[model samples]
Target: YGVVHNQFINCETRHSILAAIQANRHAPALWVKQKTYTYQEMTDMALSLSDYWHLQGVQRVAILSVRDLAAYSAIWASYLGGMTYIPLNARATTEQIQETLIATQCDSIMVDAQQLSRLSSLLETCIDRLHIYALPDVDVEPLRQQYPQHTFHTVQITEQDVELLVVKYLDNEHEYAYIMQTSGSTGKPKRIAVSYSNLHCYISQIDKLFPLNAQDRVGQYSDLTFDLSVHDIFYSLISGACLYVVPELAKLSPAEFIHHHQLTVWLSVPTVIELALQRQTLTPHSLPSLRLSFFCGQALLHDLAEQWQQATQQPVINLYGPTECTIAVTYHRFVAHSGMASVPIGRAFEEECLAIINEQGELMRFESAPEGYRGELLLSGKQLVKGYLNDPLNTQSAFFQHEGRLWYRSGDIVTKSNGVLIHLGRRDHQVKIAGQRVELEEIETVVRRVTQAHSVAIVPWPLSESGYASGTVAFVDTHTQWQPDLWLSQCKQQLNPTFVPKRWYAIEQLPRKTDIKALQQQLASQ
Candidate 1:
């Protein structure tokens, strides 16, 4: 072999993967509920839809469903058709979804019947520019009966076609690829734009973090609009791995899915795994085919990590990143008894750099620095998106350059210890209750310590015009019979009065992701 020659081929998004798959004679890709779509079938389907959308002059369309196999196929088609896609969160409220539709000025929305039902009369209330494409189900006979069956009128594909675009613009005067709405528990949700370069860069870095091949079967547990789901779909497609589509209801039933499909890699939030643990749904016996468990989205609980390690005997990789920088920027392979209170977010990916700065904006590089220094984490990488879609003010504030290197200011407060980043909490997660600045994480930490609770989260409910301290509630998951009075006393002993929860409720299990990160939204509203 003369000096090991290298070969390069470019297939950027899911559409490119579909083209490659169709060209290859032997590659097979299957979606669980949807019919098995070969590379050729996917290509033909994408071309047909692309041609139709092009004829309609639709510039962008919001995909308003979760991880349906057909939804992904249409998304790839839209990209290849020279249009942009706005991935809508299936879990969002009707008003929230409408806000996104209006914000992006989307030409239309492609939704399944199930999602359409949720909107009820709300869909009619929106401005009339939106068009709807109701997709077919696995039962082909009915699908053929309902819609016109036609081949793609256009056959050509090119690289310059716009795959995605942003409603908010960035500081450097570049538009983002897609806009993802933040999960809003603290306040009104804001949209963050992720560029095409940002998405491809992060995917490249992830390919380096966890290597994959066509032999592997991957699972999707997050909602489609979540940036993580973007990773789940694109990663599997680019690497030629079979992507197993998991319904929202089937997420907790991962054991059955894993056993049936021989799923090698699992992608989800840590909170989902914690839910399994609390319900005793997962055991070594239940999941034999599982190999790697990937967790992200929220803070990783130490107790949950220990239990998962003991059960699976598999290292859980903790990945941390914001939507602005694509999927993940830093990753850590969890080690047992690391003497750390929380799991480390670990080092940066291939195209990323992590730096911790003090409140004065001085960088914290070495562990020798004194304690109690707090600063926003600065991230610089190829994965960093260009800018928001149309909101110039936010784009400038968020995307900035420091000392000749471009950096994205992560609104999270964190500390670096022994070369690992410890996530304290989001700066905005702090709220004032009765004139005292209270950190919700601090309250939850104290409650967990004193009551030995399995998991806990505190949220402030707004008070009515009446002067009483109303609307204060705390959601907790514990092994013992949860007594509000006794727990309050224990909390008082451990924390300040302002920090103690006034109202407490218990769930059978907390809403969590595969990696043990709690989903505050899953907590039942009393």
Candidate 2:
């Protein structure tokens, strides 16, 4: 059943709604590259493109572009007109993009014209039969060269058409609307299947809690390939707020974006916020318009939240959840009196339930005094995704039904202290080196205390390269004035030999994904 959060607007109905809104006269939607579109204009253009793709027999369309509003509109049009929309990461290497294309077996790709040169060389490497089209900027002249002869018209869509809707809902849920590969913390990424029902249910439930409105101006900094993009795009559109789509490749410097755009709410990771603070990218007075700010994708750092409030005078909330559970599960508002700098993940969202479970998969009762009561965090909700894409075995392993509710094994260990969940790093990232259990975050915390280094990740070097395959390598961004030797010596004094990073690399700025998650895997691969 579709939730009545907003009249359950499907693709077919969206066009008419857009037409009606445009006829009534509304403010225009703006994007980078100085492009603007009214609700009616966007609908008409999307309808035309839908007709164009349908004529080409393109069942699945892959879009590879930076965060351009035009591309964003086109993607929705594809879905509305009955085509599966595949988002390709603009920052990914040619080979990485090619790997995704091959996995989906997509035949046609729409790439931003500016990215044509880099992707053109990579297209040659693909053996699959495919067609590549260059995407233009706001003006259609460049796109005219390729689509000139092709005529387009508005498309009629139906609920049953796979092309028109990417998500399919089942009572039992054997199928999905889209599949995204997980960040791959343990090994190769697993494809998580998300259904239209899952997205609709989750976001609608969230609406009941957050209550976004036309007065809001949302900042979209997360990349489209990541699930967080779903929140930025849909939340703004459905709630009638302005969606500012930041380009994936050419994001504004922290200061520039904040000062230029009067963003009301910000949703991103803590690392990016930390980087901006360290660089003094945004002045204290800048971004005074910001109201609500939240961090996701990683555990929230206590110090980062403290510093953020000190600088902005705005509370930063911590939102926790996995790709399998849509975008947000729990939100914790930061409150401090100056002793420690952290926020508990707080309670559940509108329709979600969060609980701690023991090794036996039993929910721990608060009254029961188990000597060292530590258990996995289990989340259950109607908005939860069905399973892994085409991998039932792993899905079964990760998701299970208990107490009449489907629960996802978050693989995160936590203990309840005064009814607040304390986040203890990832289960997989927890390491036992030379018989010493080392928490990577603990090492990082020590390093920060020693040299005031903000950006750091303790990555394990492969065993083949060293006698001990697993050893910590810290990537740091220290003050330019400090000597590298002096910092290392300070870190050594503060941390044990095993805990201290064996190797250190100085980078002007840490390379990160648009979502603000550290690109540690990208580093390991290199």
Candidate 3:
């Protein structure tokens, strides 16, 4: 059971979205491009692909995520079929794509005709990595839009392939729900293996706290690659809420989209709030339909949260967690004039562990922090991931067993204030640029390669009024051979556009060591 008569009732349903989809079959499941998909129709598509993939003994499968029916269908199918779900980011560069395919070693991928052309851009040899590339029952002239350009394989799941309607659950989880690739400090992305148990812990608790009903209209404003989409897609599905996929054009002004589509549940990063504020689309009481809203993926400044709460006239919760600990673990419902510039990240869910270790490795408790305490926030709970996929070194370093309980080092420096958890910042150089994690050391490595610099200092530039970074500026020990634009293009080829430096500066002499914060201050002065 999900939300019944506005009450959340958990019936210990199986750990799958399909069982929920079947339960809510009559309700509208998805809304995209002005079209609505009933839960029944969505089930048909998922079962079709699930049967297709299952019969063929598919284990680990990647969905190309063209942001269409095919993408969502593949995700549901993977869940229902107990396949290791790996969502390929559509916005990822060819190099990033290669890295994911290499890292995950996914034998097959579900894609549309359009994605085939997109994948063709990858190094031709990488194409040899796969033998079966399937496309979903995506009612397509979509396929005809592109010609049969490559000799590469294609397994098309058509309307004819749909089997008898089958009931399902997210629980038949073979091993993992999905492998998420987050920014890594080693100039590569960290592949996190998230189990179905972990996912159930997150969404179940979230639904219990703020149970969305079939009558509620939820917003799917995040990319499928990001874990936030898990909350957007599945939470809406299980609760029988219509998951409205934010169209590309509408994403340009998400506030307007929320108002125009009458989205009742608003969940996204604080950056989106910043965008709406700048565009002036987020005026007070403009979001009439919004009742429950969430800001996560990065820090939410108190001022922005206050503005959003005022505009929505609804509860605005600020959540915090790394990808390793599922979507977001802690939540702080916004209170007017919290007296802090940055909003509190709140505390972990009930029964979950939030262990803060100081420099001396002493545990800090929230109750006794009268003068304020600081430390690295370590997490131990059901929501935490099994470990990084295939990277034992990283998995060991980040996740460890303490007192017979597995704990994940969050790396974020945190404190306690007003009897709530306060998010100070990352202990390491890692930064969140526009909600996507950016490893400063990773960018420095790329810059070093591009310019062959002796040393590099990279800092987030042009801080917005929210006290957040939107882009980056770099300082190099030696002058680069190429211009800024050229340097950027080369870096973009290897890294996501979000991680690449936007501006560059050269210094003739360099210290053996330098501080990025010092450079940030220097830039602020200029």
Best model number under TM-score: 3
Which pairs of residues collide in model 2?
A: 67-248, 82-163, 82-164, 83-163, 83-164, 167-177, 302-341, 463-469
Give lDDT tens digits, candidate 3, residues 1-526: 5775665756252433445555677888888777898877776677677777777777788777556776787787776677778888777877677678778876676776557566556535464545434553333343334324322343444442222333332335337879988777778688888887787788888888888778899998888888888889878877878988998677779998888888999888889988998898888898879999998977788788888888899999888888899888899888886687888999778544787888999864444445477888888778888888888999989888877778888999888766678887777888878777778888888888887877678888878877678888888765456477777778878777776788888877543356666676777887
Residue-level lDDT tens digits of model 2 in 253-348? 543565577777677756566556656765555567777777776656676676666656776778877778777777777876635445667656
Best-to-worst order by lDDT is 3, 1, 2
Question: All models: lDDT?
Answer: 0.62, 0.60, 0.76
Tell how far residue 30 is off in model 3, in angstroms: 0.7
TM-score of structure candidate 3 = 0.89
**Per-prediction tally of clashes:** 25, 8, 6
TM-score of each: 0.69, 0.68, 0.89
Better of 1 and 2 by lDDT: 1
By TM-score rank, best first, the candidates go 3, 1, 2
- Scanning candidate 1 in windows of ten residues, the lowest lDDT window is 161-170
lDDT of 1 by residue, 383-474 (tens): 77665556677678877877777777777778766766788766565443432334555666666666676766666654322111222457
